[PDB]
């Protein structure tokens, strides 16, 4: 039985020795460093009196990725104040009122708010429907647009009905019940896969269309048996919906173990932990962690899936070994309690490239001191 059922969390940290009030501390500390510290470090910045954005810091822009991972981490940390103003800034500056992309965010503006591209990415509406329930179920709806379960329903209704609307297309492929990389493509990004909040959505979301997302937790965690190399555990950024690298894009080769492909190891645990459903999930959680067992954190190499390794190295290490540490809820392997002690003694990123390792590392944090969970009522 899985923490959705029991209501109790593994403590990696507490389990692997460290003490209970070291552990509060530093995931409390880590917090502050994030949204609060200093220009070295920090990710999160306040706008005026109701506003505030995660700045992807190597890309100079605000993301929908980082916009929705700012609201898990905030109400994950019971921090509504923070959350308010992540949501507000989305709801203001990001999310279409009209068009083919109505209800859906578009994945990146300035951070003046500025839409740069209208298309939206999947990954930041399933996150942001996600943090919404949670929102919701901790502190109770308020007048629009903190009226958070409406929000959530709203966002999820156009993830699936988007193409009855008019010209738009749904994030899901209705036929195989896989979330897609972008609304107009057939193919999918495995790293997108959360069918431990496709639970949560059959539970939460518009009674409609809880069916079709208690067949999307099924179909998810099939789809990655197949986008996870067998020998390493590795998967590719871009995969076709049978599971194999998709095709080189024109905006890029993403056939390869790089940035996205990371979080699927994180994914996975995270399901594994909820719901304990699929046991191949404590196999594939050793199969990675065994292939970087030996691997240096400064020598990660972007990598075929089969695990040659490219001369190029890893854009963000730190993230990679953050989602190496959280297959530790999943794996029972000799490496997880190694992973566990590295990451203890891994301080968030700085400088120019820490955005994205920052996300993860904070992730990570949360869920080896037992405190990623599941909000219901
Ligand atoms: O996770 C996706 C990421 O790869 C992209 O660069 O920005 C955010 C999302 O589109
Ligand atoms: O937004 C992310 C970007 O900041 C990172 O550098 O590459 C992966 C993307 O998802």
Redesign the pocket.
Same mark, same amino acid.
């Given at each position: 039985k899985g923490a959705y059922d029991t209501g109790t969390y593994a403590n990696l940290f507490q389990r692997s020795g460290y003490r209970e009030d070291e552990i509060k501390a530093r995931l409390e500390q880590t917090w502050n460093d994030l949204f609060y510290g200093d220009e070295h470090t920090r990710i999160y910045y306040p706008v005026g009196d109701d506003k505030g954005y995660m700045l992807?810091?190597?890309?100079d822009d605000v993301?929908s990725?980082?916009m929705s991972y700012g609201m898990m981490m905030a109400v994950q940390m019971d921090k509504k104040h923070e959350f308010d103003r992540l949501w507000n800034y989305a709801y203001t500056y990001m999310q279409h009122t009209e068009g083919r992309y109505k209800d859906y965010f578009a994945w990146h503006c300035k951070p003046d708010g500025t839409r740069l591209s209208p298309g939206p990415?999947p /990954?930041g509406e399933e996150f942001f429907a996600m943090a919404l329930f949670f929102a919701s179920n901790r502190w109770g709806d308020g007048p629009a647009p903190y009226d958070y379960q409406a929000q959530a329903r709203k966002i999820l209704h156009a993830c699936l009905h988007q193409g009855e609307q008019g010209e738009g297309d749904p994030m899901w492929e209705p036929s195989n019940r896989l979330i897609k990389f972008i609304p107009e493509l057939p193919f999918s990004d495995p790293?997108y896969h959360l069918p431990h909040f496709y639970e949560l959505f059959a539970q939460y979301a518009n009674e409609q269309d809880r069916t079709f997302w208690k067949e999307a937790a099924e179909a998810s965690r099939a789809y990655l048996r197949t986008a996870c190399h067998p020998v390493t555990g590795l998967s590719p950024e871009y995969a076709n919906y049978d599971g194999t690298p998709a095709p080189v894009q024109l905006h890029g080769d993403f056939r390869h173990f790089?940035? /996205?492909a990371y979080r699927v190891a994180a994914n996975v645990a995270l399901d594994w932990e909820w719901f304990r459903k699929d046991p191949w999930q404590v196999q594939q959680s050793n199969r990675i962690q065994a292939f970087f067992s030996d691997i240096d954190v400064s020598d990660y190499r972007r990598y075929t899936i089969e695990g040659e390794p490219f001369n190029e190295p890893a854009?963000?290490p730190v993230?990679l070994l953050a989602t190496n540490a959280m297959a530790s809820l999943a794996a029972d392997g000799p490496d997880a309690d190694s992973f566990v002690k590295r990451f203890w003694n891994t301080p968030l990123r700085q400088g120019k490239?820490r955005?994205?390792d920052n996300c993860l590392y904070f992730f990570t944090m949360l869920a080896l001191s037992g405190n990623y969970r599941v909000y219901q009522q």
């Open positions: 992807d810091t190597g890309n993301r990725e980082g990415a /990954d790293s790089y940035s /996205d854009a963000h993230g490239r955005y994205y």
